[PDB]
Each structure stands twice: as C-alpha cells, then as structure tokens.
Amino acid sequence: RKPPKGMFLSQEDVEAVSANATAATTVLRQLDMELVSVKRQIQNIKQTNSALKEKLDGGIEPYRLPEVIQKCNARWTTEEQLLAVQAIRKYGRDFQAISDVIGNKSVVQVKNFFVNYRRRFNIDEVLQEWEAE
Amino acid sequence: PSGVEGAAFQSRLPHDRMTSQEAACFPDIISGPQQTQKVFLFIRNRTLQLWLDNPKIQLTFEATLQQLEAPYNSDTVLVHRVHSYLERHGLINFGIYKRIKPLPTKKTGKVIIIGSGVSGLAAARQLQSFGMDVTLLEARDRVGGRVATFRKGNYVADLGAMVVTGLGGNPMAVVSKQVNMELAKIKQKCPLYEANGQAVPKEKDEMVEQEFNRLLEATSYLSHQLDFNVLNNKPVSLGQALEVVIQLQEKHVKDEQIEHWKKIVKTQEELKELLNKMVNLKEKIKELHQQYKEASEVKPPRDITAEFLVKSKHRDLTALCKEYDELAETQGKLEEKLQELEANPPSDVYLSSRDRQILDWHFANLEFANATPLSTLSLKHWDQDDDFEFTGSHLTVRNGYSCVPVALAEGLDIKLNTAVRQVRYTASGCEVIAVNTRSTSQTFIYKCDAVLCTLPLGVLKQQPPAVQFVPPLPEWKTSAVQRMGFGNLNKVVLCFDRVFWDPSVNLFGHVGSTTASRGELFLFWNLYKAPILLALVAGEAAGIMENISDDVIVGRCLAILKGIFGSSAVPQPKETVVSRWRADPWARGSYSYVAAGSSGNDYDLMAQPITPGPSIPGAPQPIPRLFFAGEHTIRNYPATVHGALLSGLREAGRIADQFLGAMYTL
Amino acid sequence: SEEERNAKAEKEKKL
Numbered sequence: 001r002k003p004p005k006g007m008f009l010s011q012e013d014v015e016a017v018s019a020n021a022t023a024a025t026t027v028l029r030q031l032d033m034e035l036v037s038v039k040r041q042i043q044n045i046k047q048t049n050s051a052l053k054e055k056l057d058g059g060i061e062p063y064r065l066p067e068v069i070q071k072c073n074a075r076w077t078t079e080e081q082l083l084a085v086q087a088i089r090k091y092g093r094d095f096q097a098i099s100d101v102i103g104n105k106s107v108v109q110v111k112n113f114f115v116n117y118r119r120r121f122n123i124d125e126v127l128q129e130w131e132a133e
Numbered sequence: 134p135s136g137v138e139g140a141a142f143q144s145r146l147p148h149d150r151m152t153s154q155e156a157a158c159f160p161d162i163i164s165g166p167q168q169t170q171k172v173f174l175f176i177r178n179r180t181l182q183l184w185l186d187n188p189k190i191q192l193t194f195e196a197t198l199q200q201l202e203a204p205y206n207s208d209t210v211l212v213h214r215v216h217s218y219l220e221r222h223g224l225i226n227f228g229i230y231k232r233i234k235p236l237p238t239k240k241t242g243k244v245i246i247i248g249s250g251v252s253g254l255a256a257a258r259q260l261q262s263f264g265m266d267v268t269l270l271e272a273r274d275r276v277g278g279r280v281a282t283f284r285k286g287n288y289v290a291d292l293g294a295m296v297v298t299g300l301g302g303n304p305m306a307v308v309s310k311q312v313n314m315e316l317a318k319i320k321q322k323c324p325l326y327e328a329n330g331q332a333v334p335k336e337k338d339e340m341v342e343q344e345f346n347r348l349l350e351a352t353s354y355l356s357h358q359l360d361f362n363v364l365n366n367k368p369v370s371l372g373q374a375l376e377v378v379i380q381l382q383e384k385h386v387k388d389e390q391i392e393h394w395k396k397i398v399k400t401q402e403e404l405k406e407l408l409n410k411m412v413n414l415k416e417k418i419k420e421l422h423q424q425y426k427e428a429s430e431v432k433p434p435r436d437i438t439a440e441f442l443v444k445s446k447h448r449d450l451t452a453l454c455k456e457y458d459e460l461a462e463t464q465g466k467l468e469e470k471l472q473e474l475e476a477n478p479p480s481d482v483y484l485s486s487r488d489r490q491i492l493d494w495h496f497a498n499l500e501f502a503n504a505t506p507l508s509t510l511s512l513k514h515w516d517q518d519d520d521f522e523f524t525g526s527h528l529t530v531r532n533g534y535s536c537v538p539v540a541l542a543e544g545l546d547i548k549l550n551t552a553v554r555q556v557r558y559t560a561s562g563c564e565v566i567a568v569n570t571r572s573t574s575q576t577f578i579y580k581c582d583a584v585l586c587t588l589p590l591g592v593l594k595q596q597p598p599a600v601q602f603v604p605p606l607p608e609w610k611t612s613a614v615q616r617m618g619f620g621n622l623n624k625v626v627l628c629f630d631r632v633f634w635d636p637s638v639n640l641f642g643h644v645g646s647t648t649a650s651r652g653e654l655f656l657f658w659n660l661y662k663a664p665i666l667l668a669l670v671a672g673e674a675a676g677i678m679e680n681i682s683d684d685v686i687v688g689r690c691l692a693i694l695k696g697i698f699g700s701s702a703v704p705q706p707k708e709t710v711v712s713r714w715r716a717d718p719w720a721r722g723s724y725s726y727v728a729a730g731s732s733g734n735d736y737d738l739m740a741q742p743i744t745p746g747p748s749i750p751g752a753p754q755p756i757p758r759l760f761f762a763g764e765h766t767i768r769n770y771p772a773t774v775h776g777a778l779l780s781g782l783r784e785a786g787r788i789a790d791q792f793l794g795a796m797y798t799l
Numbered sequence: 800s801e802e803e804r805n806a807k808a809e810k811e812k813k814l
C-alpha cells in the first residue's frame with residue numbers, strides 16, 4: 001500500500017513519464033538543463049562573492065579605536081549637561097547612545113536627566129527639532 | 134506438516150476444510166453438520182497419510198479400513214466413498230506402484246492419448262488403472278517430450294527441465310520414492326563475472342540484487358496501488374513497468390540534485406546581500422574614522438560643540454564597528470554552511486554502467502525462469518502461481534530426469550514415430566488420423582470413445598496447423614491459445630575431460646555487455662558429478678541464438694570461460710550439445726508464460742473439454758469427447774513437470790467419471 | 800520422410 005523504502009512513485013510522475021514514448025526523455029533532459037543552469041548560476045555568484053570578499057580584505061582593523069572605560073559618577077557637571085543637551089538634539093530618545101556619549105552616566109540617569117531638567121533645558125522642543133530629521 | 138495434517142499439506146489440500154471438488158462429490162456432507170465434515174476430513178487425511186507413507190504399493194479399500202481406528206472405521210460406506218474419490222482424482226494410487234488387485238482383462242472404453250509426455254503418461258497410467266483401453270500416439274522416437282536427457286558414456290545432461298522446485302507438497306516426491314531418482318540439492322550461491330572476466334565485488338552483487346528485488350516490489354505497487362495495467366488501450370508488461378520505475382528513480386536523482394544546488398544558490402545570495410551590506414558599512418566606517426580624526430585633531434581647549442563632535446563621532450564609529458563584527462560572524466557561519474553543502478552532494482546517478490549491467494544479469498535470470506522477455510509477461514498476472522510454490526530447497530536429478538517418463542511408460546501401449554495429423558470428434562465417437570514419421574505416405578486410423586490432447590501450446594498455436602481439428606475448436610478455445618504466451622529458453626552442454634572450475638560452486642554467472650545480449654550465455658551450471666558445464670540462453674538471445682551454429686555458440690562459451698578461468702585452463706570440449714526448442718516442431722518453444730493480455734483464466738479455458746454437436750438434428754448431446762491436459766492447462770502449477778503430472782491425473786479422473794461412472798457420489 | 804525431413808533442417812540450423 002506504500003512504495004518500498006527509497007522508491008519514489010507518485011500518481012503524477014507515472015502519468016508524466018508514460019504520456020508517450022519520449023515523454024521520459026523530455027522530462028529527464030529538461031531536468032538536466034535546469035541542473036546545468038543552476039550550476040552555472042552557482043559559479044557566477046561564486047565569482048561575485050569572491051570579488052566582494054576581496055574588497056573587504058584587511059577588515060576594519062585600521063579603523064578601530066581603543067575603547068576607554070570610565071566609571072559612572074552620580075553628579076552632573078556643566079560639561080556633561082551640555083553634552084547631554086547636544087546628544088538629545090542629535091540622537092533623540094536613544095538613552096544608550098546618550099550614555100555612551102557622556103561616558104560616565106548610566107542609562108537610567110539619562111532618563112532621570114530628561115525628567116529633572118524638564119524645562120531648564122527646553123528638552124521638549126529639542127526633541128521636536130530632532131523629530132524633523 | 135506432520136501427522137494427518139502433514140498428509141493433507143503434502144497433497145496440496147487444506148487439512149481443516151473441504152474443497153470445492155470434495156463438495157461436488159460429497160454434497161450431503163458439506164451441507165450437513167460440522168461433526169460429519171470433521172469425520173470426512175479425518176478419513177480423507179488418514180487415507181492420504183497411509184498412501185504417502187508407502188507409495189510403492191497399492192492402497193486398497195480393505196487395507197485402508199483395517200489400518201483405521203474406531204469410531205472412524207464404523208461407517209464403511211463413507212470410508213469407501215472417500216477412498217474411491219481419492220483414487221479417482223489421483224491423490225492416492227498414482228504413479229508406479231505394485232498392484233494388489235490386478236487389472237481386469239475386461240476393459241471398458243477406448244481413449245487415444247496424443248503425446249507421451251509426462252501429462253500423457255500419467256493420464257494413461259491412471260486410465261489403465263481404471264480398466265480402460267488406452268493407446269498413446271507420440272511423434273518422437275522416445276517418451277518424455279520436454280523431459281529430454283542427453284546421455285553419452287557416463288555423461289548425462291538434461292536439455293529439458295532438470296530442477297524439482299521443492300518437495301513440500303510436490304507429487305514428484307511420491308514419484309521420486311517410486312523411481313530410482315538421485316536427487317541433489319542446489320547451492321544457490323552464485324558468483325558473477327563481468328564481461329572482462331573480473332569477478333563482481335560481493336558488496337556490489339548484494340547492492341544490485343537488493344535493488345532488483347526492490348524494483349520488482351515497485352512494479353507490484355505500480356500494478357496494484359495505481360492501476361497501471363493499461364496504457365493507450367494496450368496491456369502493460371513487466372518490462373514496461375520496470376522501465377517506468379527506473380526512469381522515475383533517475384528523475385528523483387535529478388530532482389534531488391536540483392534541490393541541493395538550489396539551497397546552495399539561496400545561501401550564496403544570502404551571503405551576497407550580507408557582503409554588500411558589509412562593504413557599505415566598511416565605507417561608512419572609513420569616512421566616519423576620517424571625520425573622527427579631523428574633529429579630534431582640533432587641539433584643546435575646545436568649546437563644548439567640538440568636544441561633543443569628538444565624542445559623538447567616537448561612539449558612532451564604535452556602533453558601526455560592532456555592527457561589522459556581528460556581520461562578519463554571520464559571514465563565517467554562512468561560509469562554513471556552504472563548505473558543508475559543497476562537501477555533501479547527493480547521489481551522482483541512479484545506476485552506473487556496471488550497476489546497470491549487473492541489474493541486466495538479474496533481469497536475464499528472471500527471463501530465464503519465465504522463459505520469455507520481460508516485455509511479454511503480464512504485469513498484473515505474471516506472478517499468480519507464486520502462492521503455490523512448494524517448500525524445501527530446489528533439487529535436481531543427477532541420473533537424468535528421463536528415468537521418470539521412461540519408468541512411467543512401462544506397461545503402456547505407446548505408438549512412437551506416430552504424428553497425429555487430424556482429430557475428428559463427433560457425437561458417436563472420435564477418430565484420430567496419424568502418419569508414420571519415418572515414411573509419411575503410410576497412414577493410420579484410430580477409433581476411440583475419447584481423445585486426450587497433450588499437444589504443447591506451441592503446437593496448438595502453429596499456423597498453418599500441424600494438427601487439424603474436425604470440427605474446428607470453438608473460438609473461446611482458440612482465443613485462449615492465442616492469448617497465452619509460449620516462451621523459449623535453450624541450453625548448451627559442454628563435456629570436458631578435466632574439471633577446471635570451482636567444484637564447490639553449483640552455478641556461476643556471466644554479465645553481458647549490453648541489455649540486448651543480457652541473456653546470451655548468462656549462466657553456467659556445474660551440477661553433474663562429471664566434467665560437464667551447462668550454459669543457459671534466455672530472453673531475446675534464446676530466439677536469436679537458434680539461427681547460429683553450434684561451432685559459434687561453443688566458441689562464445691569457451692571465450693567467456695577463458696576470460697573467467699584463464700586462457701589456458703580451458704580445454705576443448707570432448708562432446709557438446711545445443712538445444713533449439715523453438716525450432717523443435719514437436720514443441721515449438723519451451724513452456725508457457727502469462728502473456729500481457731492473458732491471465733490464469735486462459736489456463737482454465739485450456740482445460741475445458743469439448744462437447745461435439747449432435748449427429749441427428751434434435752437429438753440430445755450429453756457426452757463430451759475431446760479432453761485437454763498438459764503443462765499449459767493447469768492454472769496453479771503451469772510451466773512445470775509436476776503441473777503436467779497433475780493435469781494428466783485430473784483429465785484421467787474426469788474421463789473415468791464420464792465413461793465409467795462416478796460410484797462415489799451416491 | 801518427416802523424420803528425415805526434420806533431421807535435415809535440424810542439421811541445417813546445426814551448421
């Protein structure tokens with residue numbers, strides 16, 4: 001009631017191959033043609049990927065910067081406040097980004113800063129002007 | 134099988150059930166209570182056991198009764214009915230046995246049997262046992278027919294069949310107990326050798342043998358499950374189905390290759406997208422780094438806008454750098470995946486040329502077993518009789534199968550060199566016109582009550598007819614003769630003086646170069662305890678090689694044998710024989726096969742006797758006159774010696790019922 | 800003649 005293991009005989013394929021004398025020849029050589037086409041596309045994309053891999057040779061090693069680490073400080077200096085205002089103007093609500101800019105302010109202290117300097121720094125219209133970009 | 138159940142199994146009868154024949158002869162019992170049915174069945178199985186325990190002497194009714202046990206011996210008329218039923222239908226007291234009750238000199242009825250083959254000989258012995266006057270007419274100068282044994286000196290080789298296909302349920306077991314037959318087992322171990330002479334590696338032999346069995350199962354599935362038995366209004370052959378299955382396997386191989394390379398292109402285009410993004414990212418990183426350095430080289434002290442510019446460029450560059458890092462990680466993943474894919478391609482082809490050649494050898498063995506090209510066998514019905522195969526290993530006759538018909542011919546009136554030309558059957562009897570084959574001007578007329586036709590299917594197929602029936606056989610018989618297949622296979626006996634082959638090997642193969650010549654001397658037999666090898670020709674090669682001389686055939690044989698065992702170990706054979714069964718006019722082929730467009734119902738049609746019309750118009754016509762037996766008339770055991778034996782027993786029983794009366798039914 | 804007729808054709812195919 002089932003084909004033996006590994007034998008493949010569907011109702012569609014049998015009627016396809018026995019449609020005439022050379023229907024089997026037609027089917028098999030169409031499959032051969034598609035095989036050749038896919039193999040040559042493989043070679044083409046191999047060439048293209050080889051070129052693209054060569055253009056990345058050397059990596060980004062001459063562009064990496066020594067990542068200085070500095071410890072968080074709770075107090076806000078005037079320098080850090082101005083850095084925060086500019087980072088809000090540039091990055092919007094990206095708290096991780098602003099934290100990495102300022103360097104010594106955790107991600108939570110950035111939202112804190114947002115709330116505390118609510119209007120001494122006009123953060124609302126700063127974010128408004130950011131939303132225009 | 135052991136006891137009375139074993140006796141029933143050995144007689145091809147179910148031990149716990151009454152058969153259709155037994156129902157026909159004992160309708161009072163099978164329609165009645167089950168207790169009486171069991172009593173009947175025990176008496177039947179016990180009489181069969183008594184016969185099978187000593188088939189060298191006759192089993193009389195008195196002997197059966199006094200060897201029985203009460204309460205079973207209490208009903209003597211039932212025991213007598215059972216005994217006469219088994220005796221009449223050839224289940225007991227058949228073959229060659231010492232008679233106790235000697236034959237009556239008062240004979241009854243005249244039967245002319247056409248042909249002294251095994252079927253004809255068995256039917257003649259049975260009808261003679263029943264007190265009828267029986268005379269056989271055979272065209273050859275010998276009995277046996279397609280049981281033909283070449284003998285020269287002490288060299289012996291069968292050009293007919295030589296194999297007893299199991300003793301479990303085989304009447305030839307009884308016969309072999311009655312005759313001096315030396316039976317020998319067949320080691321089915323069979324090494325192959327490609328055309329060059331190199332032996333086939335064992336692993337590869339098993340690969341292709343398993344694939345061949347699987348292909349056959351696939352054809353069976355194609356027939357039963359998809360009803361692929363008719364194509365453009367023509368019946369499908371086993372060869373057509375095998376071609377279709379092989380083509381579908383090759384199609385699946387190509388489909389798998391396409392699927393694999395398509396996964397490769399998908400992964401490669403993922404990689405292409407990734408590398409393009411990585412290039413754009415590296416460019417943005419280069420520009421951001423130059424921007425960073427320019428901003429960072431504004432020497433301090435700086436106003437806070439420039440400080441913010443420096444820090445902002447710094448972390449923008451950091452973000453893009455770890456973007457590139459994650460993308461390079463993904464690049465490594467995809468590249469190793471691609472190395473894996475390119476390292477694991479699926480199957481290259483379905484079969485190599487060498488694979489296909491060895492598969493062709495297995496197909497040639499199949500064509501040899503069936504004695505016909507697979508393009509002729511019926512896909513639906515070619516394996517119908519497989520259900521009735523006997524148990525036990527296939528054996529052979531080491532002293533020649535001919536000892537069986539010869540021994541069966543003892544005491545019979547056989548007219549050798551007597552070619553039947555015309556069979557006339559009428560309401561009042563029959564006359565058979567025959568000629569002396571040595572001088573055909575001489576003519577004979579035989580008058581009889583019944584004619585039993587043993588003529589092979591090839592003879593019945595002959596056009597123009599070698600034997601003319603008056604009146605013509607009805608259309609339902611001639612159409613069955615047309616539809617049935619009559620195949621062909623041949624043998625080459627090679628007698629040497631020195632054994633140069635492996636003595637422990639009973640048989641070994643030779644793989645052909647082409648599909649066409651796959652049957653050309655594909656198999657060699659080393660059975661006989663003498664320097665004799667038997668080459669076999671089957672398939673289309675069987676027919677084509679008959680138009681080729683013995684010199685050329687033995688030359689091809691010796692070429693193969695030199696290529697296998699070395700060009701010097703093979704001496705020139707002392708004696709050689711080449712059978713040509715399709716050319717033999719008293720056979721015109723080897724044995725029957727289920728042709729595409731035929732079935733086993735044609736085998737049943739072949740056995741139906743013919744009832745002539747009435748002589749006087751308006752008169753009743755009860756009696757049938759023309760009976761048929763032989764290899765081609767037995768649906769469950771065709772193409773065999775035991776099948777011919779059984780058909781002969783059957784027709785003898787039927788003729789005896791018709792002309793001597795069936796006493797066992799009242 | 801038929802024995803002699805089959806023998807000659809069988810030897811024909813035999814050579």
Ligand SMILES: Cc1cc2nc3c(=O)[nH]c(=O)nc-3n(C[C@H](O)[C@H](O)[C@H](O)COP(=O)(O)OP(=O)(O)OC[C@H]3O[C@@H](n4cnc5c(N)ncnc54)[C@H](O)[C@@H]3O)c2cc1C
Nearest residue numbers: 248250251252272278279293294295296553719763764774
């Ligand atoms: C090459 C070969 C190998 C075989 N191997 C085996 C095997 O291994 N195992 C197996 O079980 N079976 C085998 N068989 C089959 C087996 O030999 C036959 O099925 C059986 O022996 C034939 O029985 P039969 O009496 O029905 O046919 P036949 O024996 O052919 O009966 C017909 C007889 O009538 C004669 N005759 C023909 N025309 C006329 C005429 N016009 N007038 C008078 N007489 C005529 C014939 O010569 C013949 O003697 C083989 C057959 C062949 C050809």
